[PDB]
Swiss-Prot record:
Disease: Leukocyte adhesion deficiency 1: LAD1 patients have recurrent bacterial infections and their leukocytes are deficient in a wide range of adhesion-dependent functions.
Chain location of the short sequence motif Cell attachment site per the record: 136-138
Modified residues (Pyrrolidone carboxylic acid): 1
Location of this fragment in the whole protein: 23 to 482 of 769
Quaternary structure (record): Heterodimer of an alpha and a beta subunit. The ITGB2 beta subunit associates with the ITGAL, ITGAM, ITGAX or ITGAD alpha subunits. Found in a complex with CD177 and ITGAM/CD11b. Interacts with FGR. Interacts with COPS5 and RANBP9. Interacts with FLNA (via filamin repeats 4, 9, 12, 17, 19, 21, and 23). Interacts with THBD.
Disulfide bridge partners, by residue number: 3-21, 11-186, 14-40, 24-51, 125-139, 159-184, 188-206, 198-209, 211-220
Name the UniProt record assigns to this protein: Integrin beta-2
Positions bearing carbohydrate: 28, 94
């Protein structure tokens, strides 16, 4: 992974700087002559400065799938997919096409998407024929009741607004419903179980004390 950042001030800003960026929420991680942006780096760079693995914030793209009770599903499965998309990190899931009759050539495609979403397909066709990273799924000569698999990869270029879209095999009425959601939030430790954090005179936000008015210092220790 790599991480190019510039004077980021928060975990959110860090995570938005690229898919390899991660954030250390460890208390007091910043030395006297360091900006808060030192908390933002690749995972191996943070481990090397002594951030523990569970203090490293790193929201990751995820796919979750659902099948119906499947008296209802025919030729395409799964029927429902939910994607959590961290910008620049593809989420991948497999779609299986299976037909009780002989199928000749199967194309897998999606409806028109906004500029912020990129979709590619790998096609795992019969006879070990495989295509990678194409604009649509494409297999030739499907025998009877033999599944073919398409690997769908979806990447967001920024933190998107939630939306759905569909994937279909051309010539068939089956639908895979794809729900997409952003994956841009850090789930950092908050201060609920310690009134001593930030001297009880600031808010703890992903390892950084945001001091109450009149208080200053990295731990809100100084009063002016
Ligand atoms: C995070 O750092 C704070 C700040 O404490 C300072 O302590 C100095 C001895 C020196 O190392 C300096 O670089 C550092 O920033 C820690 O707070 C201190 O905690 C002690 C008790 O352990 C108190 O007696 C001090 O009053 C208090 N000082 C301040 C300025 O708040 C804090 O413990 C530390 N947190 C963790 C989890 O290590
Ligand atoms: C979708 O299916 C493909 C093919 O079955 C999976 O690719 C295989 O992944 C394993 C690792 O888990 C490798 O050992 C195999 O060599 C891969 N096969 C091929 C043909 O490349 C892929 O992992 C599946 N994707 C998901 C998200 O489950």
């Amino acid at each position: 992974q790599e991480c190019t950042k510039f004077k980021v001030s928060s975990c959110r800003e860090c995570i938005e700087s690229g898919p390899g960026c991660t954030w250390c929420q460890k208390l007091n991680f910043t030395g006297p002559g360091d900006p808060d942006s030192i908390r933002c780096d690749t995972r191996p760079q943070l481990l090397m400065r002594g951030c523990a693995a569970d203090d490293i914030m790193d929201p990751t793209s995820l796919a979750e799938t659902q099948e119906d009770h499947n008296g209802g599903q025919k030729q395409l499965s799964p029927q429902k997919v939910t994607l959590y998309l961290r910008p620049g990190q593809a989420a991948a899931f497999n779609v299986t096409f299976r037909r009780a009759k002989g199928y000749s050539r199967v194309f897998l495609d999606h409806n028109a998407l906004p500029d912020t979403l990129k979709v590619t397909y790998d096609s795992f066709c019969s006879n070990g024929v495989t295509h990678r990273n194409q604009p649509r799924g494409d297999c030739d000569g499907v025998q009877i009741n033999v599944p073919i698999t398409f690997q769908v990869k979806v990447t967001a270029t920024e933190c998107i607004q939630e939306q759905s879209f569909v994937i279909r095999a051309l010539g068939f009425t089956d639908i895979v419903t794809v729900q997409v959601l952003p994956q841009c939030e850090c789930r950092c430790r908050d201060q609920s179980r310690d009134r001593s954090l930030c001297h009880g005179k600031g808010f703890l936000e992903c390892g950084i004390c945001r001091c109450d008015t009149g208080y200053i210092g990295k731990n809100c220790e100084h009063h002016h």
